[PDB]
RNA sequence: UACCUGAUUGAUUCUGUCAGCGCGAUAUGCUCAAGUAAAAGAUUAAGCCAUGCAUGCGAUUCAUUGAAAUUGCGUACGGCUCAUUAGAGCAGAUAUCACCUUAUCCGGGAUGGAUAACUGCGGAAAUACUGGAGCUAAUACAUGCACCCCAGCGGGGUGCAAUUAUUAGUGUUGACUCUGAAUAAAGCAGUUUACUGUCAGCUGACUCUAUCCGGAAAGGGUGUCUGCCCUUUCAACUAGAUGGUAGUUUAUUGGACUACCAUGGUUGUUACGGGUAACGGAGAAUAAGGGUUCGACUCCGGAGAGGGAGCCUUAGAAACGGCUACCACGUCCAAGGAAGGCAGCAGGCGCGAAACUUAUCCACUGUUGUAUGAGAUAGUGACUAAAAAUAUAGUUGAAUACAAAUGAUUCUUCGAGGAGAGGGCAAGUCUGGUGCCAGCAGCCGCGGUAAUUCCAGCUCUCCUAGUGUAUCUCGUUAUUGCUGCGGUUAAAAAGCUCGUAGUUGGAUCUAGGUUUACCUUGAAUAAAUCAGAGUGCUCAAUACAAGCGCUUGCUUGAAUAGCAUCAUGGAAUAAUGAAAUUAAUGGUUAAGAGGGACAA
RNA sequence: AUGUCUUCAUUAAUCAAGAACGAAAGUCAGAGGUUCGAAGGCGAUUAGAUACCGCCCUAGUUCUGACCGUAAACGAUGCCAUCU
RNA sequence: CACACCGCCCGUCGCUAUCCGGGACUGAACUGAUUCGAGAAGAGUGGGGACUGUGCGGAAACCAUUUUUAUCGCAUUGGUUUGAACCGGGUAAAAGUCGUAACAAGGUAGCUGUAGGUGAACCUGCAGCUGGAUCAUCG
RNA sequence: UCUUAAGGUAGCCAAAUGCCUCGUCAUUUAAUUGUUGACGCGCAUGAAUGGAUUAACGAGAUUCCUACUGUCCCUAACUAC
RNA sequence: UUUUUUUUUU
């Protein structure tokens, strides 16, 4: 069926070449998985040597990662955003490796005032639920308050970051492969790529 | 071939084991393990040509399945088991020991041996390294991976493995000074003391090695085995004491 | 003179390739046209049957007829004019017969007083010439 | 599966078929030693070229060659050996001076009538094949077969022949019934 | 054994071929006393095949020791052929820090329900077809039995493997995003013995089965460098073509594929195209040296199973003694349907010049070991290699061998054929016929009424149980010439000049008293064959045996040599580079080489 | 070529492909057309004479501008360097 | 030339045999590639849900689509073989017709290139060569 | 051998030129006075009364292949006037 | 001035 063989292209100077053999097993290639967005769809596909991938057909949760915070949280994919390939796979919903698309802040939210104590520019006007509120003005002994100052030690957040916490749909970069590792675990954008990817972004809802 | 290999052609197979040409098709297939396929010989062909313990290859796998063979005391009933070098053979109900060395033509011959030989045997280190959870180990060239090793043994080093205890006794070193075997090559079944080493970079080293009578060649690293410290070997070693005669020699030994 | 230089291995070599093509016997033995042109298609022998007989004026100074017969191959169908060798040995080959034929010696060339004639018979009605001349058989 | 056998040949035939002096010399060494064809003399012509050839080839390297020395010193052995070479020449530029008498008187035909045990050449061969000679207790029935030195000297009738103690002949049997 | 001989002329010397002459391969004629090894439907038709075989053997035994069935394992090895194939494939060296793995090694890791045989009911003409119904088993099916976070009282997580992101650096390699130690998640389906017979004395020890991780070993996929046929009546070729980025697929890298982008890539140092009666190599024939030709074929690598294509199972297949479809060609039908793949062994038809018994066995050699048309035995066999009767064989029955046998090895009964005979070239001017006819004759030439050459008859020579014939290879051939040809008249100097590629290039640097190229020596380099020691298989081809004491034994031989890469030393020869606060500061000479200037 | 106590300093030799020139005849266009003269026509000679010999002649032979690229284009001998 | 000029020798034409070439016929046959059209079968994906286990699960036929793509049709193109009226070349063949081209100054010296003509060899014009029939001829 | 001023040369042809004639052979078809290609003693071809070719062009004459079709087998129906 | 030929083998 497909096959990747280096035979059947044209030789460096242009000749044509032999066909070596009848084409051969080891040398197969499968259809692309194509995940989109939507319920969870995971199938095993059995490889050489009895090993088994796990192809993404559609994926709705990523396991995201906060790299300059050192967290891992599972957040939501929401939207396609900008894809360097081709702009049929934005158009189309298509989660590939390298792909930009857009998360939840909820998860990454809670996460942050229950390790910081401190709020993630919560709304200037809006009383924390009964949810944040059992995570944030919580009371304990001064010897488990203790671990809490430390950590809040270093705790400021970048401007770009909090604008994308305000919007509650943070940007990223999915780099997993889908159709490979089955899932479509990701890293949030933070800094200079994330302005470049931003301007891309912009750039192209004005064009 | 669509896959793996299970037969060996007598033509095919290595010369060192000396195999008659109008003695049938096959040879004898070392199953893969402790040694290589050109760098070991089948318990079979030890039984049926060595030893003269089988006139045929039935007798052998009769004698085989007695389970009256020991190798390196763990007895196997595998005439295909790869029995190479420093392997220790054990018939218990006749009471022999043999250990497998190296003939100066390159040959494996029947070393006799007591049992303060056999209790013993040498591995070389073909590697060290790091297994999960953090407790090195060493590899040798026979497979055997030995776990919390002295940290001083290093790559290319000779350790002393016991067969009854499963453990390492002594580690001679590979450096200036120390008789070394020589496994591979034209000098197979050559034994002399190690001298200066060339050091390639990026392919494999040489070693310059003279024996006792003088006579002095070179080697790659992975053809040379640490025997011993100084100049004394730590098995015995068969009629001939590792000394390559010329063929005037031979002749002139043998009248 | 030919070149000498320490590097004119290629020069050499091609020259002597291209001129090797300028030997008759190169030439005859690599040509390519060979099988299609030679009747035997490479064989030393071959097999047919015969059509007429023939006599042929023996080349000058000679004068004699010479008996040869007409055959037809079976492995091609190609038409070739074989000799009948030793005395009265035409009366044994009668039209319509089965008949081994060889090469007369010369690889291809006429041979002796005989115009145009590079076979011979070597067996016909599966029975040998030479026996038949003989008789140590007869006519099957 | 079964492999290609080994064989050799002993046996060159002379560039030129025909001329008197080979043919005439030939026919003369074929009437002095008992032998059956041309093919015989070509045979030990044969032997004895390769012989002078190794030798020759020997000699165009110096003297203490260690190849040389194995060589040269184990071809004068053989031929000792057999009794071809004389056991006080030792040397292959005087291993270059044989002929094919010196290894035809070597075979066991000229021995027989040689030591008494046939009249002519033709009777010792006739004897061998009727199985009446033996060597070192060894009934030997090859009139080519190769007499050593060693055994030279060990050839008398057979232990079981008529002519060395046996039950009688044909011919006696027949008169005597 | 580094070799020649006949033929152009009235005669001579040359050039030149033809012919002769030696070996080898294939076919074939005549003939062949017995024996030993021993090739053998490759050549053309990878054409078609009747018939028989070639892959079958721990857990689960209420059938009568173990049948049947379910599992497990294997059938990807082995065997055959050489069609395709010319950066394919192969050889040597070399990467895989870009990858994947069963069998075998080392370390670490006594739970329920259904289904067959079995019973019975049945369908079809026909399959190694199968549906229901009643059980009924399992190593089948299922189920599994010191640091991090909150709070330092206490709660949880942390096995291996693994996705992503991050931290520090317990080990290496030349170099590691490699291996270990950790941190945050989350699914992930994979794994940490409900197994058989058990034995010893609550304590022990087995055999077995299952099972993941790490490292080996073995195998494979890919990558690199060098070499490998003819052809210009093939000179320009290439458009996924060359590269970049982001992805997808794969076991992994990669235009392998996709999107966007750039215009690249090969070539007279022979690209591209075409041909091959082309699988590559180890090797074979011939053979002073240098070579010429071949290599389907027993070993290694590759490919294929009528031609294509697509897949299931798996550790491993694009498998074909596995399936699915199409094409070609068959087979059985009760016409509704069901099938086939000998380039496995043995045989059959065709094709042809061309190639063997529809035999016996696991007794030998290996495969995990009863099974093995792999393998080993016998049959036809003037392929072939060695050894040998016609003068001075057979036969009867014994003894041996073998899985059984035959034939070999011991006793006993009886008891010559092929070419030749003018020269080349060894060997008759003998007898009769025919009169340039019949015929011979490789070549030159014999035969025209007195034939050494034919047809006979009689005679001899070569070789010899072999010897001729045909085609082809090598030598002969210094008639392909590198060694090493020839070009005034025998074939052959372009009409002449310029000129790119190519080839080749003057002398000159320590004589005395940094790169290369090249040479020397080592390293890595499957056997079988070739060269090469020893050994009376009776010799020899062969083979790799064997040879002494005396019984419970000692010693054995089964050798030695045979482009590219790396390293060491050498520094002639041939290229190549340096310079346009002190010091000799730094340019060879100016060719009986060349160019240019000046003079008249 | 010779002369040179002038200059440069290896810049050289031979050259696939490639390019210039290249007798006579011949072709194209335009001028000229004396002489000679293929073809053609006559008179001879001859068995014939489509020839040799003689007479009259056409293209051509001459010039200009383009084609062709061949000769016994021969010294039937390539070029460069050196010795006898 | 050596059978020695009663030598040798060249062409057209005529007969016989044989090989090859051109050739109208959109000639013919076999075979390989390429574009396009159709397209079996498998595999992936999205539906579907007979049937049976506990609103949930597993699922067969079937449907649609994507991909690999056999195979069949025209069409183009490459290579091999081949029929053909007729028109030509070459060769061979003991004793065909016409002449005399060449070898002697071969009776017009021969030959090369070029052009024209003629039954045929050949003849003629222009320019060359000696392989000439002159190594030479007086200043 | 008669004979002319010269006796049709190079070419071409049963032609838009050939009577005999539907010339003979091959090609095209199942079948051809047709087409094309050959042959040529040509009633009576032929060289600026121009000969032989010829790409492109043609409301020019002719033959064939393909596609297409009521021209036809074999006619029928409908619309406007 | 004119002067063309000589069957095949030996």
Redesign the interface.
């Known amino acids: 069926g497909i096959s990747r063989d280096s035979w059947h292209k044209r030789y460096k100077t242009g000749a044509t070449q032999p066909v070596p053999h009848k084409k051969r097993k080891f040398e197969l290639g499968r259809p692309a998985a194509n995940t989109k967005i939507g319920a969870h769809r995971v199938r095993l596909v059995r490889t050489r040597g009895g090993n088994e991938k796990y192809r993404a057909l559609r994926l709705d949760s990523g396991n995201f990662s906060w790299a300059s915070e050192q967290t891992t949280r599972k957040t939501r994919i929401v939207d396609t955003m900008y894809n360097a390939t081709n702009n049929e796979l934005v158009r189309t919903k298509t989660l590939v490796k390298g792909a930009i698309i857009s998360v939840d802040a909820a998860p990454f939210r809670q996460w942050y005032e229950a390790h910081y104590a401190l709020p993630l520019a919560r709304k200037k006007n809006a009383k924390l639920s009964e949810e944040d509120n059992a995570i944030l003005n919580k009371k304990r002994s001064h010897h488990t308050m203790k671990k809490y100052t430390e950590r809040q030690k270093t705790a400021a957040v970048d401007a770009l970051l909090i604008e994308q916490f305000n919007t509650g749909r943070l940007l990223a970069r999915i780099s997993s492969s889908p159709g490979q590792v089955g899932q479509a675990n990701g890293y949030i954008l933070e800094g200079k790529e994330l302005d470049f990817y931003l301007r891309k972004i912009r750039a192209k809802k004005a064009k | 071939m669509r896959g793996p290999k299970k037969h060996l052609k007598r033509?095919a197979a290595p010369s060192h084991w000396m195999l008659d040409?109008?003695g049938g098709?096959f040879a004898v297939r070392p199953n893969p393990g402790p040694h290589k396929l050109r760098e070991s010989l089948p318990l079979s062909l030890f039984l049926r040509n060595r030893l003269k313990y089988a006139l045929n290859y039935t007798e052998a796998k009769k004698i085989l399945t007695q389970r009256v063979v020991r190798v390196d005391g763990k007895v196997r009933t595998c005439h295909k088991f790869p029995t190479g070098f420093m392997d220790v053979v054990a018939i218990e109900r006749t009471n022999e020991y043999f250990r497998m060395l190296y003939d100066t033509k390159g040959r494996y011959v029947v070393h006799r041996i007591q049992a303060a030989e056999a209790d013993f045997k040498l591995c070389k280190v073909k590697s060290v390294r790091t297994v999960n959870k953090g407790v090195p180990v060493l590899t040798t060239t026979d497979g055997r991976t030995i776990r919390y090793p002295d940290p001083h043994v290093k790559v290319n080093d000779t350790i002393v493995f016991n067969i009854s205890t499963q453990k390492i006794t002594d580690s001679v070193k590979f450096e200036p000074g120390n008789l070394a075997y020589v496994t591979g090559g034209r000098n197979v079944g050559r034994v002399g003391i190690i001298g200066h080493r060339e050091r390639l970079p990026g392919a494999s080293d040489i070693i310059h090695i003279k024996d006792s009578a003088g006579h002095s060649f070179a080697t790659r690293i992975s053809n040379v085995f640490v025997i011993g410290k100084g100049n004394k070997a730590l098995v015995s070693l068969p009629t001939g004491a590792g000394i390559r005669l010329?063929?005037?020699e031979e002749?002139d030994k043998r009248m | 003179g030919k070149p000498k230089g320490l590097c004119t291995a290629r020069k050499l070599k091609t020259h002597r390739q291209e001129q090797r093509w300028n030997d008759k016997r190169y030439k005859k033995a690599h040509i390519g046209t060979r099988w299609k042109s030679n009747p035997f298609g490479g064989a030393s022998h071959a097999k047919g049957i015969v059509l007429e007989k023939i006599g042929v004026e023996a080349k000058q100074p000679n004068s004699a007829i010479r008996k040869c017969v007409r055959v037809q191959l079976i492995k091609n169908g190609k038409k070739i004019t074989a000799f009948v060798p030793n005395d009265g040995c035409l009366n044994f080959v009668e039209e319509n017969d089965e008949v081994l034929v060889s090469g007369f010696g010369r690889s291809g060339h006429a041979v002796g007083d005989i115009p145009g004639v590079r076979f011979k018979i070597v067996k016909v009605a599966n029975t040998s010439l030479i026996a038949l001349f003989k008789g140590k058989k007869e006519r099957p | 599966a079964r492999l290609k056998t080994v064989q050799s040949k002993v046996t060159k035939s002379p560039r030129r078929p025909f001329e008197k002096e080979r043919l005439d010399q030939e026919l003369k060494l074929i009437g002095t030693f008992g032998l059956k064809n041309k093919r015989e003399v070509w045979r030990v012509k044969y032997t004895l070229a390769k012989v002078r050839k190794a030798a020759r080839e020997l000699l165009t390297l110096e003297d203490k060659d260690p190849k040389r020395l194995f060589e040269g010193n184990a071809l004068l052995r053989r031929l000792v050996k057999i009794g071809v070479l004389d056991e006080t020449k030792m040397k292959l530029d005087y291993v270059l001076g044989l002929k094919v008498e010196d290894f035809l008187e070597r075979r066991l035909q000229t021995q027989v009538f040689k030591l008494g045990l046939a009249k002519s050449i033709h009777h010792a061969r006739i004897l061998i094949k009727q199985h009446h000679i033996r060597v070192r207790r060894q009934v030997v029935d090859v009139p080519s077969f190769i007499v050593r030195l060693d055994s030279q000297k060990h050839i008398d009738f057979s232990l079981q022949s008529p002519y060395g103690g046996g039950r009688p002949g044909r011919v006696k049997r027949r008169t005597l019934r």
Do not use: E, N
């Open positions: 033509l040409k109008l098709v010329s063929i005037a002749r």
